[PDB]
Amino acid sequence: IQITRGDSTITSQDVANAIVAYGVWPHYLSSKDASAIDKPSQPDTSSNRFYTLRSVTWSSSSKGWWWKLPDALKDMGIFGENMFYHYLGRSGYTIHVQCNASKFHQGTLIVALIPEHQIASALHGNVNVGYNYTHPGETGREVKAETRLNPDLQPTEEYWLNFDGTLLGNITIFPHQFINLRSNNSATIIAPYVNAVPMDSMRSHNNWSLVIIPICPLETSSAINTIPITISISPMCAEFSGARAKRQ
């Protein structure tokens, strides 16, 4: 089947065998939890549609990829603008990861959505991760062997340590889904807003972090020996506050 949401519509979503992060469905901020007493209203279905990032290439040597939300969507039409022209904001998402392969391809991905995924820096000593590298945008972050710049600002490349000192394989404690090519070829996660406060500065704080690690290497005898992984994200109950003048 196909999930048409807004002016966007993604085919191949099918049935609803997706995971709902922590069992809580994305909801609008209730007045009881609200920060400034209550706001008259915040109903806007304008930012609620599907933004499909460029498909990443999964090769026989791919070690992993990760994106951070809301960061990844900072440049996605309405949502992007909204979060740029507002001081505070909160949002849930419906991440949809799917890859095209055949019955002659084999491989497995772990698609996990990690809350407050605080990355660890690459080097030893008194170093820390720099702003630019945890905010790669929709491009995401690919695990590479090549040497990079402001090295002491760079985050770790140890994917098997979840990029934060924990063991991959325990990463299943977070809302996730496995993508076993011979069984399924897509996964879906519906996550609500998660933070210790009602809303926040989307610019400085990334609530969720989408991680994708190939637990079982991709193998195939096809001419081109790589397949694409397509990611579609859709904001859920997005709300904003402290709007500022735009086009100024």
């Binding site: 992060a21 922590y22 069992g23 809580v24 209730s30 939890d33 070690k63 019955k103 002659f104 391809h105 084999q106 491989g107 497995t108 809350p115 008194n126 994917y159 098997w160 063991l167 991959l168 394989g169 325990n170 299943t172 404690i173 496995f178 076993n180 090519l181 011979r182 069984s183 609500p192 998660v194 933070n195 210790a196 406060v197 009602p198 690690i213 190939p214 637990i215 079982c216 290497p217 193998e219 195939t220 005898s221």
Partner: protein, 237 residues
């Protein structure tokens, strides 16, 4: 006023006591609580989450995602026995898994564990694996036959990429010590009932994953300090 008699123990500071104490900020009204998704109330919640077992914990794959999978062959000359692991929650490789880690934080455990397997092969790759459990007391099987003579499962991969089997609780005492035993521990052995069968133009090998979690009856008692984490560093601020 009121005649009182002081009891042995008064004025002592027992680190495990439970008494009231004056509030240092009696007037301060703490920030209200809001609804944060995912509240945990019992560690058992964490123990019932399947986590990958570093089944292939050899020096070759030690610090890579390859330590979590076993490679199945399609060639007729691969040894019948694939892999083997002890069933005690605290023994390697289980130790470093979710349930293993939480278990290492206690001294007594009890209950059944649930092993799940996932075939990371191709959609046209088929095979029959023999998953067998060996109760504590006897040494792990050495031949496919011995293995199937005990409790086991002939899992036919084609058409079902997953399967789970429950290891029961077999013990003299109700709870057993959290520390790994050899003669008091069970075994999970995996055998080739048939090798990997595949059509033409297909990867000759496929990976196998292994998960583990506790059941409803799983439980821990008498907390101690985990030994899976030894801190001998600065922790400089």
């Amino acid at each position: 006023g009121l005649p009182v008699f002081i009891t042995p123990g008064s004025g002592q500071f027992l680190t495990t006591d439970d008494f009231q104490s004056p509030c240092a900020l009696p007037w301060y009204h703490p920030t209200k609580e809001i609804s944060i998704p995912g509240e945990v109330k019992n560690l058992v919640e964490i123990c019932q989450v399947d986590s990958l077992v570093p089944i292939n914990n050899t020096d070759t794959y030690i610090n890579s995602e390859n330590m979590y999978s076993v490679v199945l062959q399609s060639s007729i000359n691969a040894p019948d026995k694939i892999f083997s692991i002890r069933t005690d929650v605290a023994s390697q490789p289980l130790a470093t898994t979710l349930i293993g880690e939480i278990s290492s934080y206690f001294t007594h455990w009890t209950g059944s564990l649930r092993f799940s397997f996932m075939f990371c092969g191709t959609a046209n790759t088929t095979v029959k694996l023999l998953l067998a459990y060996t109760p504590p007391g006897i040494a792990e099987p050495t031949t496919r036959k011995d293995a199937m003579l005990g409790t086991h499962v002939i899992w036919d991969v084609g058409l079902q990429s997953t399967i789970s089997m429950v290891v029961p609780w077999i013990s003299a005492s109700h709870y057993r010590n959290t520390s790994p035993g050899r003669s008091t521990s069970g075994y999970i052995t995996c055998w080739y009932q048939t090798r990997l069968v595949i059509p033409p133009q297909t990867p000759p090998t496929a990976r196998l994953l292994c998960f583990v979690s506790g059941c409803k009856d799983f439980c821990l008692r008498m907390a101690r300090d985990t030994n899976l984490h030894l801190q001998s560093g600065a922790i400089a601020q």
